[PDB]
Short mmCIF file of C-alpha atoms and ligand atoms in Angstrom, two decimals:
data_model
loop_
_atom_site.label_atom_id
_atom_site.label_comp_id
_atom_site.label_asym_id
_atom_site.label_seq_id
_atom_site.Cartn_x
_atom_site.Cartn_y
_atom_site.Cartn_z
CA UNK A 1 0.04 0.45 0.69
CA UNK A 2 2.89 2.51 0.43
CA UNK A 3 3.69 4.49 -2.41
CA UNK A 4 6.76 1.80 -2.89
CA UNK A 5 5.05 -0.52 -3.04
CA UNK A 6 2.77 0.97 -5.96
CA UNK A 7 5.88 2.13 -8.09
CA UNK A 8 6.89 -1.69 -8.10
CA UNK A 9 3.44 -3.15 -9.55
CA UNK A 10 3.96 -0.06 -11.95
CA UNK A 11 7.80 -0.99 -12.29
CA UNK A 12 6.26 -4.74 -13.36
CA UNK A 13 3.71 -4.00 -16.02
CA UNK A 14 6.98 -1.97 -18.47
CA UNK A 15 8.26 -3.81 -20.63
CA UNK A 16 11.42 -5.01 -22.07
CA UNK A 17 11.77 -1.18 -24.04
CA UNK A 18 9.47 0.66 -21.63
CA UNK A 19 12.13 -0.94 -18.79
CA UNK A 20 15.05 0.25 -20.81
CA UNK A 21 13.86 3.85 -20.84
CA UNK A 22 13.09 4.35 -17.83
CA UNK A 23 15.72 2.36 -15.56
CA UNK A 24 18.46 5.59 -16.80
CA UNK A 25 15.20 9.30 -17.58
CA UNK A 26 17.15 11.58 -15.66
CA UNK A 27 19.55 9.90 -13.97
CA UNK A 28 22.75 10.84 -13.96
CA UNK A 29 26.15 8.53 -15.36
CA UNK A 30 29.88 8.07 -15.06
CA UNK A 31 31.27 7.61 -18.47
CA UNK A 32 32.58 4.18 -17.62
CA UNK A 33 34.58 4.68 -21.00
CA UNK A 34 38.58 4.86 -20.84
CA UNK A 35 38.32 2.99 -17.16
CA UNK A 36 35.81 -0.40 -19.10
CA UNK A 37 39.38 0.44 -21.88
CA UNK A 38 42.65 0.36 -19.17
CA UNK A 39 41.01 -2.93 -17.34
CA UNK A 40 40.75 -4.52 -20.76
CA UNK A 41 44.28 -3.55 -21.44
CA UNK A 42 45.47 -4.69 -17.88
CA UNK A 43 46.30 -0.96 -16.65
CA UNK A 44 46.94 -0.86 -13.11
CA UNK A 45 48.12 1.58 -13.01
CA UNK A 46 45.85 4.48 -13.79
CA UNK A 47 43.59 5.67 -11.37
CA UNK A 48 40.42 4.25 -12.63
CA UNK A 49 38.08 2.68 -11.11
CA UNK A 50 37.34 -1.40 -10.76
CA UNK A 51 33.46 0.08 -10.66
CA UNK A 52 30.92 2.31 -11.07
CA UNK A 53 31.04 1.54 -7.62
CA UNK A 54 33.22 4.29 -6.74
CA UNK A 55 31.65 7.88 -7.99
CA UNK A 56 28.25 6.66 -6.40
CA UNK A 57 30.60 6.16 -2.52
CA UNK A 58 32.35 9.49 -3.64
CA UNK A 59 29.16 11.03 -3.66
CA UNK A 60 27.87 10.40 -0.19
CA UNK A 61 31.77 11.40 0.81
CA UNK A 62 32.20 14.51 -0.47
CA UNK A 63 28.46 15.55 0.47
CA UNK A 64 29.70 14.48 4.57
CA UNK A 65 26.73 11.66 4.37
CA UNK A 66 30.02 10.04 5.31
CA UNK A 67 32.45 10.19 6.31
CA UNK A 68 36.10 7.68 5.52
CA UNK A 69 38.21 7.64 9.05
CA UNK A 70 40.35 4.68 10.82
CA UNK A 71 39.68 1.61 9.85
CA UNK A 72 36.91 0.64 7.33
CA UNK A 73 35.37 -2.27 6.73
CA UNK A 74 33.38 -3.01 3.52
CA UNK A 75 30.66 -5.69 3.14
CA UNK A 76 29.89 -7.16 0.35
CA UNK A 77 32.87 -5.36 -1.54
CA UNK A 78 32.62 -7.20 -4.78
CA UNK A 79 35.47 -5.83 -7.68
CA UNK A 80 36.79 -3.63 -4.20
CA UNK A 81 34.36 -0.27 -5.63
CA UNK A 82 35.01 1.47 -2.07
CA UNK A 83 37.68 -0.15 -1.53
CA UNK A 84 40.51 1.66 -3.61
CA UNK A 85 37.77 4.76 -2.99
CA UNK A 86 38.68 5.00 1.10
CA UNK A 87 42.50 3.40 0.81
CA UNK A 88 43.11 6.82 -1.67
CA UNK A 89 41.30 8.48 1.63
CA UNK A 90 44.32 10.43 4.77
CA UNK A 91 41.55 10.28 6.48
CA UNK A 92 41.47 6.16 6.25
CA UNK A 93 44.30 3.76 8.37
CA UNK A 94 43.14 0.24 6.56
CA UNK A 95 40.71 -1.46 4.60
CA UNK A 96 39.23 -5.23 4.85
CA UNK A 97 36.63 -6.55 2.31
CA UNK A 98 35.17 -8.68 2.40
CA UNK A 99 32.73 -10.76 -0.46
CA UNK A 100 31.18 -13.46 -2.14
CA UNK A 101 33.19 -14.00 -4.72
CA UNK A 102 32.25 -17.63 -6.05
CA UNK A 103 29.48 -19.28 -8.53
CA UNK A 104 29.35 -15.72 -10.24
CA UNK A 105 29.23 -13.28 -7.91
CA UNK A 106 31.89 -10.42 -8.82
CA UNK A 107 35.38 -11.97 -7.73
CA UNK A 108 38.05 -8.54 -5.30
CA UNK A 109 40.02 -7.12 -9.01
CA UNK A 110 43.92 -5.54 -8.06
CA UNK A 111 44.62 -2.71 -9.42
CA UNK A 112 46.84 -0.36 -7.62
CA UNK A 113 45.70 2.74 -7.21
CA UNK A 114 46.65 4.99 -3.61
CA UNK A 115 46.53 3.13 -1.18
CA UNK A 116 46.39 0.28 -2.49
CA UNK A 117 48.84 -1.44 -0.47
CA UNK A 118 46.25 -0.36 2.83
CA UNK A 119 43.49 -2.92 1.33
CA UNK A 120 42.84 -6.56 2.61
CA UNK A 121 40.82 -8.62 0.63
CA UNK A 122 38.91 -11.91 1.66
CA UNK A 123 36.86 -13.09 -1.35
CA UNK A 124 34.13 -16.87 -0.15
CA UNK A 125 32.58 -14.56 2.44
CA UNK A 126 29.37 -14.66 2.91
CA UNK A 127 29.16 -11.58 5.70
CA UNK A 128 25.86 -13.22 6.71
CA UNK A 129 27.87 -15.28 9.48
CA UNK A 130 31.22 -13.43 9.36
CA UNK A 131 31.71 -12.45 12.93
CA UNK A 132 31.18 -8.83 13.54
CA UNK A 133 35.09 -6.83 13.91
CA UNK A 134 35.99 -3.54 15.25
CA UNK A 135 36.14 -0.26 12.75
CA UNK A 136 35.62 2.54 12.45
CA UNK A 137 33.46 2.83 9.20
CA UNK A 138 31.27 0.32 7.69
CA UNK A 139 30.14 0.04 3.87
CA UNK A 140 27.74 -2.38 2.91
CA UNK A 141 26.18 -2.44 -0.34
CA UNK A 142 24.34 -5.46 -0.45
CA UNK A 143 21.41 -6.15 -1.97
CA UNK A 144 20.08 -7.83 -4.94
CA UNK A 145 16.77 -6.78 -6.87
CA UNK A 146 13.17 -8.71 -7.68
CA UNK A 147 10.11 -8.45 -8.74
CA UNK A 148 8.71 -9.62 -5.87
CA UNK A 149 8.36 -6.02 -2.84
CA UNK A 150 7.86 -9.64 -0.58
CA UNK A 151 11.55 -10.55 -1.23
CA UNK A 152 13.16 -7.55 -2.36
CA UNK A 153 11.62 -7.01 1.55
CA UNK A 154 13.11 -9.52 3.25
CA UNK A 155 16.47 -8.88 1.72
CA UNK A 156 16.74 -5.78 2.83
CA UNK A 157 15.88 -6.90 6.10
CA UNK A 158 18.34 -10.33 6.21
CA UNK A 159 21.26 -7.21 5.17
CA UNK A 160 20.02 -4.20 7.94
CA UNK A 161 19.65 -7.47 10.70
CA UNK A 162 23.29 -8.91 10.06
CA UNK A 163 24.51 -5.10 9.59
CA UNK A 164 23.22 -3.84 13.07
CA UNK A 165 25.48 -6.47 14.44
CA UNK A 166 28.71 -4.93 13.72
CA UNK A 167 27.26 -1.61 14.02
CA UNK A 168 26.68 -2.49 17.59
CA UNK A 169 30.75 -3.27 18.27
CA UNK A 170 30.43 0.43 18.08
CA UNK A 171 31.26 2.24 14.64
CA UNK A 172 31.68 6.17 14.17
CA UNK A 173 30.64 6.25 10.06
CA UNK A 174 28.29 4.04 8.44
CA UNK A 175 27.22 3.89 4.36
CA UNK A 176 24.45 0.55 3.78
CA UNK A 177 22.90 0.30 0.94
CA UNK A 178 18.74 -0.51 1.88
CA UNK A 179 17.21 -2.22 -1.33
CA UNK A 180 13.77 -1.91 -0.85
CA UNK A 181 13.73 0.46 1.80
CA UNK A 182 9.58 1.69 0.68
CA UNK A 183 8.34 -1.88 2.76
CA UNK A 184 6.79 -0.63 6.26
CA UNK A 185 9.11 -3.82 8.66
CA UNK A 186 11.29 -1.77 6.18
CA UNK A 187 10.84 1.23 7.30
CA UNK A 188 10.11 0.65 10.63
CA UNK A 189 13.55 -1.43 10.99
CA UNK A 190 15.25 1.90 10.63
CA UNK A 191 13.35 4.38 12.58
CA UNK A 192 14.22 1.65 15.28
CA UNK A 193 17.60 1.89 13.44
CA UNK A 194 17.74 5.71 13.33
CA UNK A 195 17.15 5.61 17.26
CA UNK A 196 19.54 3.89 18.19
CA UNK A 197 23.00 4.20 15.66
CA UNK A 198 21.47 8.08 14.01
CA UNK A 199 21.73 8.97 10.00
CA UNK A 200 19.31 8.44 7.86
CA UNK A 201 18.75 7.11 4.41
CA UNK A 202 19.30 9.17 1.62
CA UNK A 203 18.52 8.67 -2.34
CA UNK A 204 22.16 8.44 -4.06
CA UNK A 205 21.60 10.12 -8.35
CA UNK A 206 24.12 7.49 -9.31
CA UNK A 207 21.03 4.88 -8.77
CA UNK A 208 18.20 3.97 -11.77
CA UNK A 209 15.45 4.04 -11.62
CA UNK A 210 14.38 0.29 -11.86
CA UNK A 211 14.87 -0.02 -8.11
CA UNK A 212 14.24 1.88 -5.01
CA UNK A 213 17.64 2.03 -3.41
CA UNK A 214 18.49 4.38 -0.75
CA UNK A 215 21.25 4.11 1.79
CA UNK A 216 21.40 4.37 5.07
CA UNK A 217 23.62 6.50 6.57
CA UNK A 218 26.42 7.85 9.32
CA UNK A 219 25.75 11.96 8.43
CA UNK A 220 22.68 13.60 8.08
CA UNK A 221 19.30 12.32 10.01
CA UNK A 222 16.17 12.81 8.90
CA UNK A 223 12.25 11.78 8.66
CA UNK A 224 12.48 8.33 7.27
CA UNK A 225 9.23 8.26 5.75
CA UNK A 226 8.97 12.03 4.58
CA UNK A 227 12.59 11.40 3.01
CA UNK A 228 11.56 7.22 1.00
CA UNK A 229 7.65 9.00 -0.24
CA UNK A 230 9.97 12.06 -1.51
CA UNK A 231 11.16 9.42 -3.56
CA UNK A 232 8.89 7.16 -4.59
CA UNK A 233 6.96 10.79 -5.40
CA UNK A 234 9.84 11.46 -8.34
CA UNK A 235 10.25 7.50 -9.38
CA UNK A 236 6.73 7.84 -10.35
CA UNK A 237 7.61 10.82 -11.65
CA UNK A 238 9.41 9.48 -14.25
CA UNK A 239 7.52 6.49 -15.02
CA UNK A 240 4.37 8.92 -16.59
CA UNK A 241 7.44 10.55 -18.38
CA UNK A 242 10.15 7.89 -19.70
CA UNK A 243 12.34 9.87 -22.00
CA UNK A 244 15.99 8.06 -21.29
CA UNK A 245 17.35 11.15 -20.97
CA UNK A 246 20.84 10.66 -19.17
CA UNK A 247 23.49 12.94 -17.18
CA UNK A 248 26.78 12.78 -18.46
CA UNK A 249 29.70 12.73 -15.54
CA UNK A 250 33.19 12.64 -15.50
CA UNK A 251 34.42 9.34 -13.13
CA UNK A 252 36.98 9.11 -10.20
CA UNK A 253 40.15 9.71 -11.41
CA UNK A 254 42.10 7.76 -8.18
CA UNK A 255 45.89 8.46 -7.01
CA UNK A 256 48.41 5.88 -7.80
CA UNK A 257 50.58 3.81 -5.67
CA UNK A 258 51.44 2.83 -2.35
CA UNK A 259 50.59 5.09 1.21
CA UNK A 260 54.11 4.40 2.31
CA UNK A 261 56.16 5.51 5.76
N1 SAH B 1 25.87 -12.01 1.08
C1 SAH B 1 27.12 -11.87 0.63
N2 SAH B 1 28.40 -11.80 1.50
C2 SAH B 1 28.68 -11.03 0.64
N3 SAH B 1 29.11 -10.78 -1.01
C3 SAH B 1 27.49 -11.07 -0.33
C4 SAH B 1 26.61 -11.39 -0.46
N4 SAH B 1 25.94 -11.60 -0.86
C5 SAH B 1 25.74 -10.48 -2.84
N5 SAH B 1 27.70 -10.29 -1.62
C6 SAH B 1 28.40 -9.33 -3.17
O1 SAH B 1 27.96 -7.74 -2.45
C7 SAH B 1 27.95 -7.35 -3.96
C8 SAH B 1 27.47 -6.09 -3.52
S1 SAH B 1 28.09 -4.77 -5.58
C9 SAH B 1 28.81 -4.28 -4.00
C10 SAH B 1 29.73 -3.25 -5.38
C11 SAH B 1 31.21 -1.85 -4.71
N6 SAH B 1 30.29 -1.29 -3.57
C12 SAH B 1 32.09 -1.89 -5.80
O2 SAH B 1 31.56 -0.19 -5.73
O3 SAH B 1 32.71 -1.93 -6.89
C13 SAH B 1 28.42 -8.77 -4.96
O4 SAH B 1 29.56 -8.54 -5.46
C14 SAH B 1 27.34 -9.33 -4.21
O5 SAH B 1 28.13 -10.92 -4.51
#
């Protein structure tokens, strides 16, 4: 019954053509051409991002939605876009990335952008069964889309359930993907987490319209229900006018080399 649940229903009614167009309507996208060429060539010293994720985290970081400091842990690191971005920040002292990296799941990519030497990647790891570790900055970018809102809700609550174990260890900063913030059980869990750990959910402009994902971050505090519905309204306006118009932006280029001394 929430606006988001209606959005899901309408989204499933779209055909292949409509979906493609709607998905990119009025969104921002980084140009990945150069990065893809460099990675295909096996270049590791050009500072290009291993995934579109680097730009996503940069957006939150550059405007204070999440501070990247001290010991960073990245749950569901995949290729490592967030790990490399974090590793390049002077305030960060170490980065530990964990991901499944198997049976189709993306494995950590090895490049040598600034601070690559302070990153420890660990694949073949299900973060839902990983014993929480003390850290200062907790990142998690997990959440698989589903045509079923019930399923997206289940997946989102599971992620929040696991993340709560890590936040309970005491963390200063966090940025966690919330796949389906529009589901009522999720809204309630977010309200409870907000009272316990602070923060709020923010929509990243680089997210495609095909997902209602928002990120639970430590750098701001606001009315969760209100802001989730603001995004539901935006997503629905875009479905009524699916122009497929995209705004291209320059991708992230990080410094290179090891952080030493
Ligand atoms: N239970 C789990 N444990 C560990 N990793 C998981 C997981 N479920 C999903 N994942 C992984 O989480 C990743 C989400 S995509 C993460 C992209 C990353 N932020 C970047 O910037 O590149 C995927 O690789 C997915 O395979």
